[PDB]
Amino acid sequence: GCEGKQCGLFRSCGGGCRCWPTVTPGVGICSSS
């Protein structure tokens, strides 16, 4: 639903998205749900 986005501090997603962390501490990616 809101996948392919960046989460964490600069979260470009909202609602029901999984915030999977990346290589940068505090930076992640928003998943489908």
Number of C-beta neighbours around residue 13 at 10 A:
19
Considering its fold, how many domains does the chain have in total? 1
**CB under 8 A, 24+ apart: contacts of 29-33:** 29/3, 29/4, 29/5, 30/2, 30/3, 30/4, 30/5, 30/6, 31/3, 32/1, 32/2, 32/3, 33/1, 33/2
Burial of 7 (0-12, 13-18, 19+ CB in 10 A): buried
Experimental technique: NMR
For residues 28 and 21, is the Cβ–Cβ distance under 8 A?
yes
Using CA atoms, how far apart are residues 24 and 1, in angstroms rounded to an integer?
Answer: 24
Tokens of 19: 């915030």
**Helix segments in the chain, DSSP class H:** none
What are the helix and strand counts (H, E) for the chain? Answer: 0, 3
Strands (E), 1-33: 5-8, 19-21, 27-30
